[PDB]
Design a protein around this ligand. Structure first.
Ligand SMILES: C[C@H]1O[C@H](O[C@H]2[C@H](O)[C@@H](O)[C@@H](O[C@H]3[C@H](O)[C@@H](O)[C@@H](O)O[C@@H]3CO)O[C@@H]2CO)[C@H](O)[C@@H](O)[C@@H]1N[C@H]1C=C(CO)[C@@H](O)[C@H](O)[C@H]1O
Ligand SMILES: C[C@H]1O[C@H](O[C@H]2[C@H](O)[C@@H](O)[C@@H](O[C@H]3[C@H](O)[C@@H](O)[C@@H](O)O[C@@H]3CO)O[C@@H]2CO)[C@H](O)[C@@H](O)[C@@H]1N[C@H]1C=C(CO)[C@@H](O)[C@H](O)[C@H]1O
Ligand SMILES: [Ca+2]
Length: 572
């Protein structure tokens, strides 16, 4: 297996969320012709690869991650031929395109499930996870175990007709596939994987890549939340008894037969268990998204917010940057996605127009200097921030946001202090901050739509929009275009280099080196705080030359780092 791998190792990925990128026909929903009309723009950012979020036929309970037919397109996004055309349009512009592979579960509207739920005697009954009910000391019906769904409530839904519980780690409308069933495996390989590989896509982002294989005895999850009755089972369903077997099968039957890239969502906590997924010697997948960085400011199982521990952040970056150079594996780096809040609001400052611009550049230096495959999310390049405090809870259309808030409403009997704390939690880390439509210009709804958008546009759009940043040399967009050019030109150090952490105990400045096998070495220093901090590069490098600062080289002062100032020096 000798492959073309440089294109995905060095490539810049731009993730498009179809419902929110560009509406071509005034119904308020983004669509594929709209995407096609903005591919020139996507290319102009420095993108090599487009990651298209789910666009298949789907009732949109979980905005496309509940799929009812892998071989058909969500009608608002366009026709089947619109999708074939999008692939060609990307290829025409020198852009690769990867689709989202969501096969841990399907919609409850998928024909497979309609048949499986039909009857215990149906041929596809075993294609999903059906378990009998249990009874307590008082004789009341209870589910097989304490598993909590990732979206709240029990992970088992009761089907009255067949008197059995079915598993759903996500919503009740997303029943989980039984990956022990070999007939289910074959139908998924045919419909979800090879159908699209045969129509010329360049690979897949694999949704929840670690949780396909459940442990046969479905035991109770550990007490992760002290005193709570239900417990999230992520820690026991990840890397299950058949997981590696399954990825090996996907590789042998499909991924190895085409010139593609595969990135899986979710990584183990250890280097060696991670290498079981991404070591090129394992012939499974190419790279993984780790949730570790995204978890530095909140704990989702307890819905709590916390201040970022700078030392923990250093250890978290090094943890997965380690893969490049010292192993035959690969890694990824990203600050934003369709499941996260905006990076400038969470890791920098969105307080003022000046701060929004400064913050966009600061985080661009942090991402651009990380080894592995770099991923951008639509709007990260212009610095879209979180929806402000004035946006009411009713605008948070995400099912996860609605479920959590409603859980607080029910369990606290509308305690207004509890709801305010719930709102504040969501204002920081809800998925809705990524789904507010892309901001093209200062017209009505930022030019995303001629009609009324499905989701409210962030009200900062008159200032923050593509049109306002295009011809301003000082904009976040032009900073991103420049730093991606810098990254490509110095790929030995930025893409493929080995990362080492210096000045570890410093709680205000993160300093790391990027070194290529040739010996060429860069030193990167980021002041994450709101105050100027004394910083002497001569204490970490004998000789250094400033290459760039996120605040402008002429504003860099020797002996210190300004608030949210990131600098790159060539050393040795
Ligand atoms: C949305 C996302 O849910 C899962 O990821 C999050 C977990 O639910 C959180 O609890 C938290 O996980 C932590 C683990 O509990 C902990 O053991 C440790 O590993 O750290 C984790 C981070 O603190 O954070 C996770 C990241 O948000 C789930 O695993 C992930 O796959 C889900 N995302 C995709 C799944 C679906 C289902 O189709 C979609 O709704 C999303 O759009 C997907 O992209
Ligand atoms: C103390 C803290 O103040 C500043 O942080 C503020 C931001 O500048 C504001 O933009 C605002 O951020 C909120 C966003 O508007 C909002 O969208 C939301 O989602 O989250 C943000 C709230 O967290 O409010 C912030 C005040 O909370 C300042 O920029 C920042 O540096 C300051 N952080 C200090 C904390 C540490 C300890 O970890 C020390 O190193 C320094 O005192 C500062 O770094
Ligand atoms: Ca539309």
């Amino acid at each position: 297996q000798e492959r073309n791998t440089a294109w995905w190792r060095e490539g810049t990925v731009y993730q498009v969320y179809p419902s929110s990128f560009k509406d071509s026909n005034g119904d308020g929903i983004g669509d594929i012709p709209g995407i096609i009309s903005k591919l020139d723009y996507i290319k102009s950012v420095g993108t090599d690869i487009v990651w298209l979020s789910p666009h298949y036929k789907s009732p949109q309970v979980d905005m496309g991650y509940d799929i009812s037919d892998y071989k058909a397109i969500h009608e608002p996004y366009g026709t089947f031929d619109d999708c074939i055309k999008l692939i060609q349009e990307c290829h025409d512009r020198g852009l690769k395109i990867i689709f989202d592979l969501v096969v841990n579960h399907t919609s409850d509207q998928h024909e497979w499930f309609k048949q499986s739920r039909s009857s215990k005697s149906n041929a596809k009954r075993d294609w999903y996870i059906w378990k009998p009910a249990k009874y307590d000391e008082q004789g009341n019906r209870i589910p097989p175990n304490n598993w909590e769904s990732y979206f709240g409530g029990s992970a088992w839904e009761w089907d009255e007709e067949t008197q059995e519980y079915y598993l759903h780690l996500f919503a009740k409308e997303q029943p989980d596939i039984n990956w022990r069933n070999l007939q289910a495996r074959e139908a998924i390989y045919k419909d979800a994987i090879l159908f699209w590989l045969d129509r010329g896509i360049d690979g897949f982002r694999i949704d929840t890549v670690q949780i396909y294989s459940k442990p046969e005895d479905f035991p109770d999850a550990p007490e992760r939340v002290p005193g709570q009755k239900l417990q999230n089972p992520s820690i026991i369903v990840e890397t299950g008894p058949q997981l590696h077997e399954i990825l090996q099968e996907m590789n042998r039957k499909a991924f190895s037969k085409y010139d593609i890239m595969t990135v899986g969502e979710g990584s183990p906590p250890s280097l060696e268990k991670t290498l079981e997924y991404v070591s090129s010697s394992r012939h499974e997948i190419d790279m993984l998204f780790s949730f570790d960085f995204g978890a530095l400011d909140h704990r989702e199982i307890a819905h709590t917010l916390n201040d970022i521990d700078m030392v923990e952040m250093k250890e978290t970056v090094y943890r997965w940057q380690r893969l490049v150079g010292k192993t035959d594996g690969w890694t990824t780096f990203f600050l934003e996605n369709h499941d996260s809040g905006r990076s400038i609001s969470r890791f920098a400052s969105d307080a003022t127009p000046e701060a929004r611009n400064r913050s966009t550049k600061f985080l661009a230096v942090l991402q651009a200097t990380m080894s592995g495959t770099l991923y951008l999310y639509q709007g990260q390049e212009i610095g879209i921030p979180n929806l402000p405090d004035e946006v009411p809870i009713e605008e948070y259309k995400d099912v996860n946001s609605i479920n959590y808030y409603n859980a607080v409403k029910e369990d606290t009997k509308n305690d207004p202090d509890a709801l305010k704390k719930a709102k504040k939690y969501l204002q920081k880390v809800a998925r809705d901050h990524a789904r507010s439509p892309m901001q093209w210009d200062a017209s009505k709804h930022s030019g995303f739509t001629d009609g009324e958008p499905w989701m409210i546009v962030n009200p900062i759009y008159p200032e923050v929009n593509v049109a306002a940043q295009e011809w301003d040399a000082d904009s976040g967009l032009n900073f991103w275009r420049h730093i991606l050019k810098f990254r490509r030109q110095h790929k030995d150090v930025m893409v493929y280099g080995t990362l080492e952490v210096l000045d570890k105990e410093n709680t205000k400045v993160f300093t790391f080196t990027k070194a290529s096998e040739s010996g060429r070495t860069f030193l990167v220093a980021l002041n994450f705080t709101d105050k100027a901090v004394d910083y002497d590069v001569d204490q970490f490098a004998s000789k250094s030359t400033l290459l760039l600062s996120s605040i402008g080289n002429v504003h860099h002062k020797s002996g210190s780092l300004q608030p949210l100032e990131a600098v790159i020096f060539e050393i040795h």
